[PDB]
Amino acid sequence: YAWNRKRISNCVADYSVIYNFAPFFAFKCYGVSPTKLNDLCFTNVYADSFVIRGNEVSQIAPGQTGNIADYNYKLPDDFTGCVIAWNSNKLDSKPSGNY
């Protein structure tokens, strides 16, 4: 409900180190491909970071309703970008519960 937004500008972006930074499976992009990100380039890149439940990862997609997608984080229909999601059971989980 209070997701951060970071502006990335005036720099050179290397997308090969993203795999080394975090242990995720799929670099699921929509308007582009993950293998062609290093050739062409853009104006500005914005990074939005938040934590959800594993049921609601599928709701982070253009043109879809639900609970996160309607009241927490809505993506536009003309979304050009990539969604990167990975499990966080070792850092964001406690035996007494998380609040």
Partner: protein, 50 residues
């Protein structure tokens, strides 16, 4: 073993088939049938039907 799920080892076996241009050396389990002639029948010659 303490790494994330994206950094785990993965055993990969790639099976690479080539389409039939030579006579077939490997074929799956299918019982053959005696050849007939001069009749409108369904045939199956090395995997292609008709």
């Amino acid at each position: 073993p303490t790494y994330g799920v994206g950094h785990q080892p993965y055993r990969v076996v790639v099976l690479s088939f080539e389409l039939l241009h030579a006579p077939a050396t490997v074929c799956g389990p299918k019982k053959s049938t005696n050849l007939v002639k001069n009749k409108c029948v369904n045939f199956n010659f090395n995997g292609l039907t008709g």
